[PDB]
A paper describes a structure:
POGLUT1 is an inverting GT-B fold (CAZy GT Family 9018) glycosyltransferase and its EGF-like domain substrates sit in a cleft formed between the canonical N-terminal and C-terminal domains. The structures reveal the basis for POGLUT1’s ability to recognize diverse EGF-like domain substrates and for the requirement that they be folded. The three EGF-like domains studied are positioned almost identically in their respective complexes and 25–30% of their surface (740–830 Å2) is buried by POGLUT1.
Unlike other protein-O-glycosyltransferases that can glycosylate both serine and threonine, POGLUT1 can only glycosylate serine3, 15, 27 and our structures now provide an explanation for why this is the case. Given its main chain conformation (Φ = −90 ± 5°, Ψ = 15 ± 5°), threonine could not access this rotamer owing to the steric clash that would ensue between its sidechain methyl group and its own carbonyl oxygen atom. To confirm this rationalization, we mutated the O-glucosylation site of hEGF12 to a threonine residue (hEGF12:S458T) and measured its ability to be glucosylated and determined its structure in complex with POGLUT1 and UDP. Consistent with the requirement for serine, the threonine mutant was not glucosylated, even at a concentration of 100 μM, and as shown by the structure, the conformation of the O-glucosylation motif was essentially unchanged. However, the threonine sidechain was found in the gauche (+) conformation (χ1 = 66°) where it hydrogen bonds to Arg107 of POGLUT1 and the carbonyl oxygen atom of the C1(−1) residue of hEGF12. In this rotamer, the threonine hydroxyl group is not positioned for in-line nucleophilic attack and its methyl group makes contact with the sidechain of Asp133, an interaction that shifts the Asp carboxyl group relative to that seen in all of the other complexes. Given the mainchain conformation of the O-glucosylation motif, only serine can access the sidechain rotamer required for activation and in-line nucleophilic attack on C1 of the donor substrate.
Residue numbers in the entry:
A (entry chain A): 31 to 385
B (entry chain B): 452 to 491
Write the structure that this text describes.
């Protein structure tokens, strides 16, 4: 009865091109795709317009020194971005760029001509250039009390998740699917409602975020207590959804050794194109219409389910290390700088970013 | 207007206020900064 899914998995694995690189070259196609609209060159006038439109924070690099406009709406996100740029700036040529640190992308594809804005998340309907989000170092959501200063330090969180996964080998994991998050997209609602109807099948509950104003923000129930990502690893099946844009939850779930149920296929981060459905995770239709069949399938094909979870965990373990984040930053900005068709001049009043 | 408070910009149990194309974090006593990140 599972032939359709079993064949899909065999097909996807036969199609799969494994990455054997020890560096971030496995993501190079994302850079090439994101820079394709700028192959005709980025002019000084184009850059001046992007800056005037305040689509992001204006950075400049000259002589391996980083400069920035005064204003940043989210200082902690600029600090996270700056952490990585400063790591690699000794090898970067002169350039300038606008780095959007808001959640949502800024350059819809229907805009002509394309203008270059760096954003952490997009869909294929945007021309923003993806970069590794600030949160790999600092500045992610401050979920009280578990991440009081903001979700960050991917290097440390990786280690904590690997230790937690070791405490919860697959066979000891709980078979009720699990989700804890806030109502940042209504696409999450059908899972919460399915959970309320069938709590043995799914344990999915809305926590509150800092914009909570009423019970409407938790679908009419008291908010659930927040749960550390390391405490997700006891569950076999972990759901991931878009929020405002893509969610930082996603990468963490793989390191639990659990099987990720990834809902939808529109909202991306730079590493997502290398994570493949049925190879690394279970794809779920955006409207959740096939979620009950998928949960029955994985329960009836637990050996396959485990194989998928282990591949996803290994991919994040081996190809989304801190060094991959820094490498991608360096390769992205180096490649981007080639398309500036003019010589950058430091702006009056931009302070240097140290250290 | 984007409600920036949805992404929990305020640290250390501060309160987030969504304003006209900006947000403000109202710190617990003892904290300051845009994100209430500086512990006085
Ligand atoms: O109980 C919770 C709720 C949230 N988070 C994390 O906090 C961040 C924000 O989650 P939320 O659902 O509020 O927003 P999202 O960014 O997913 O739209 C994500 O990395 C979640 O994994 C968490 O670890 N535990
Ligand atoms: C990165 O890895 C690829 C092979 O995976 C190799 O061709 C390339 O030379 C490497 N680059 C550096 C700078 O190590
Ligand atoms: C599995 O988790 C669910 C949901 O959290 C819980 O209700 C159930 O009791 C757990 N089952 C076992 C056997 O621990
Ligand atoms: C830009 O700078 C390069 C390298 O310093 C120089 O050789 C070139 O003449 C300049 N081109 C301009 C200003 O158009
Ligand atoms: Ca606002």
């Amino acid at each position: 009865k599972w032939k359709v899914f079993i064949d899909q998995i065999n097909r996807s694995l036969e199609n799969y091109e494994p990455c054997s690189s020890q560096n971030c070259s496995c993501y190079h196609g994302v850079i090439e795709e994101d820079l394709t609209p700028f192959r005709g060159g980025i002019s000084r006038k184009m850059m001046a317009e992007v800056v005037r439109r305040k689509l992001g924070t204006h950075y400049q690099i000259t002589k391996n020194r980083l400069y920035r406009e005064n204003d940043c709406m989210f200082p902690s996100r600029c600090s996270g971005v700056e952490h990585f740029i400063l790591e690699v700036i000794g090898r970067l040529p002169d350039m300038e760029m606008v780095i959007n640190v808001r959640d949502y992308p800024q350059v819809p594809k229907w805009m002509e001509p394309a203008i270059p804005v760096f954003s952490f998340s997009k869909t294929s309907e945007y021309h923003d250039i993806m970069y590794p989000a600030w949160t790999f170092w600092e500045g992610g959501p401050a979920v009280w009390p578990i991440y009081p200063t903001g979700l960050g330090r991917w290097d440390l969180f990786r280690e904590d998740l690997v230790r937690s996964a070791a405490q919860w080998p697959w066979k000891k994991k709980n078979s009720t699917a699990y989700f804890r998050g806030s109502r940042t997209s209504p696409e999450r609602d059908p899972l919460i409602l399915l959970s309320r109807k069938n709590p043995k099948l799914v344990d999915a509950e809305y926590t509150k975020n800092q914009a909570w104003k009423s019970m409407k923000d938790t679908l009419g129930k008291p908010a659930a207590k927040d749960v550390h990502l390391v405490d997700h690893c006891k569950y076999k099946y972990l759901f991931n959804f878009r929020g405002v844009a893509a969610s930082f939850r996603f990468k963490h779930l793989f390191l639990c050794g659990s099987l990720v149920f990834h809902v939808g296929d529109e909202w991306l981060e730079f590493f997502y194109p290398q994570l493949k459905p049925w190879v690394h995770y279970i794809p779920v239709k955006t409207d959740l219409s096939n979620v009950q069949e998928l949960l029955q399938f994985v329960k009836a094909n637990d050996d396959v389910a485990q194989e998928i979870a282990e591949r996803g965990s290994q991919f994040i373990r081996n190809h989304l290390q801190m060094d991959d984040i820094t490498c991608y930053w360096e390769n992205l900005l180096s490649e981007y700088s080639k398309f500036l068709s003019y010589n950058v001049t430091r702006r009056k009043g931009y302070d240097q970013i140290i250290p | 207007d984007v409600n920036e408070c949805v992404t929990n910009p305020c640290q250390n149990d501060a309160t987030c206020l969504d304003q006209i194309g900006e947000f403000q974090c109202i710190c617990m006593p003892g904290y300051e900064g845009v994100h209430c990140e500086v512990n006085t």
